[PDB]
Design a binder for this molecule. Structure first.
Ligand SMILES: O=P(O)(O[C@@H]1[C@@H](O)[C@@H](O)CO[C@H]1O)O[C@@H]1[C@@H](CO)O[C@@](CO)(O[C@H]2O[C@H](CO)[C@H](O)[C@@H](O)[C@H]2O)[C@H]1O
Length: 489
């Protein structure tokens, strides 16, 4: 079998499933682990954007009450170390001790915030586990299909510990772990004891090539089979090669810039909203994205389904109001730092370059500050770029896990969110779908735009480039799927 060589924008600091949640982690962890329920992006001939939930580690599942889902596990499934997967492994993945409990903050810092109001799971037998919540939650199934729900082995994980497990992971996935050289590569080999769609590559190498130019030149050479995180400006050149092509898709993610509200200059919404109101997103989509990116109407995405508002007005663009807000704010004229990790996010640097000029024309002076892969101290950062993968078929993620009263934007970044925002966050968690929940999400979307804790830029069009003899198609998520989606020749 052929060894797959990948040229990537970055690598996660840990291969622990939850700690790996990023634009760079899922493409690796999806090969090491499996979930109970899997999303089949290619269901009913869809171009890698289907929302259909299929059985994976769980052969079948059933909803008992408004707060619990039972899982009937697939039998004789093995972890890479040779240990058999049981209800105890699933119970440990969703346990207080490891994920959502107070003691889990040392293992997985974002576990509690990204999790549902979980209760300790119920093991019924070797292949039967009930996942439950303390309060009603109709979000169990979507969470179970997410990047939060990759099954870890209890015994091996407990022996090693979260930090050590992240450097030497063991899962049930189609690709076992081989080696991890920080700031260099991640090597995975074919797991031929795999239960499902069998591995087609003998090995997979995730090689970091931080500079997109070096990455393209690498594919042309040809050092790599598939390269990630390109810009639609790379389409013309790559496609002009007979053996090469680009493969792109709009991903269920949004690029953004956020503030450190612990800093005196960003304590008031005045300057934050002024920066948001000066952002001309349509020219950014023309200049940098060549029409390929999508501008959402606020914290609203179609993957929310019943909680998506298609009648929602576009985010306000008002240069004159922005000027007024800068003047009303306490902003003196002191340069404000904007932190970026080169081009970890596609078009990160050209986007900031454009925005610095937009902000200059409103009275704000913004300065670029770059940081090497792996982040500066919180107190040393003012403005910074970020992204949020909308990991649920509901509006809960990411407005609640990231911007909620138990989330990192308020607790770590110091956003003094209005009481009304936090109250609605509690309702949407517990309530079923209806007018109350729909309007609750809409008022939160209105509060988010008024407060400006973060400024949504656009939905990036993910651009990959591969060798034509490598048959792989992208999915509408910040991950790569190779299950029934990888062949050579
Ligand atoms: O990749 P991100 O956009 O990940 C998002 C998540 O933060 C979450 O909001 C849900 O959607 C995802 O898209 O952002 C990175 C974030 C993730 O940990 O932290 C940053 C900050 O610099 O990157 C660090 O973590 C990475 C993972 O270990 C990364 O490999 C590393 O280079 C770090 O800098 C951010 O880019």
């Amino acid at each position: 079998r052929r060894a797959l060589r990948l040229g990537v924008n970055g690598l996660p600091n840990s291969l622990e499933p939850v700690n790996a949640i990023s634009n760079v982690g899922p493409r690796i962890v999806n090969q090491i682990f499996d979930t109970l329920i899997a999303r089949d992006f290619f269901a009913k001939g869809a171009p890698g954007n289907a929302i259909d939930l299929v059985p994976a580690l769980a052969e079948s599942w059933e909803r008992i009450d408004e707060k619990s889902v039972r899982f009937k596990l697939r039998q004789k499934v093995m972890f890479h170390d040779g240990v058999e997967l049981t209800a105890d492994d699933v119970a440990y993945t969703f346990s207080s001790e490891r994920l959502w409990g107070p003691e889990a903050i040392k293992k997985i810092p974002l576990g509690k915030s990204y999790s549902l109001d979980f209760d300790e799971p119920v093991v019924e037998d070797k292949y039967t586990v009930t996942l439950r919540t303390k309060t009603p939650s109709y979000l169990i199934e979507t969470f179970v299909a997410s990047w939060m729900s990759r099954i870890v082995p209890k015994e091996y994980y407990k022996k090693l510990g979260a930090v050590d497990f992240g450097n030497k992971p063991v899962g049930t996935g189609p690709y076992k772990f081989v080696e991890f050289v920080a700031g260099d590569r991640v090597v995975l080999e074919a797991n031929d004891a795999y239960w499902g769609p069998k591995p087609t590559a003998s090995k997979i190498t995730y090689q970091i090539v931080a500079e997109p130019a070096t990455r393209v030149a690498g594919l042309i050479s040809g050092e790599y089979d598939i390269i990630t995180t390109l810009t639609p400006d790379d389409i013309q050149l790559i496609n002009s090669y007979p053996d090469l092509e680009t493969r792109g898709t709009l991903i269920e993610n949004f690029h953004m810039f956020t503030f450190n509200m612990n800093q005196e200059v960003f304590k008031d919404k005045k300057l934050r909203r002024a920066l948001a109101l000066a952002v001309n997103r349509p020219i950014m989509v023309e200049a940098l994205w060549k029409k390929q990116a999508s501008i959402p109407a606020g914290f609203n995405f179609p993957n929310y389904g019943e909680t998506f508002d298609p009648k929602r007005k576009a985010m306000e663009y008002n240069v004159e109001e922005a000027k007024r807000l800068v003047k009303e704010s306490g902003y003196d004229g002191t340069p404000i730092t904007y932190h970026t990790m080169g081009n970890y996010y596609a078009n990160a640097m050209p986007a900031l370059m454009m925005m610095i000029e937009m902000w200059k024309q409103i009275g704000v002076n913004v300065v670029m500050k770059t940081y090497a892969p792996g982040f500066p101290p919180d107190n040393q950062t003012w403005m910074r770029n970020w992204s949020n993968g909308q990991w649920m078929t509901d509006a809960y993620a990411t407005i609640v896990p990231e911007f909620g009263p138990n989330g990192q934007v308020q607790k770590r970044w110091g956003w003094k969110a209005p009481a009304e925002f936090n109250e609605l966050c509690q309702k949407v968690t517990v309530l079923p779908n209806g007018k109350e929940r729909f309007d609750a999400y809409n008022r939160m979307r209105d509060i988010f735009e008024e407060e400006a804790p973060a400024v949504i830029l656009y939905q990036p069009y993910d651009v990959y480039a591969a060798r034509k003899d490598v048959h792989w198609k992208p999915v509408s998520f910040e991950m790569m799927e190779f299950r029934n989606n990888l062949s050579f020749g």
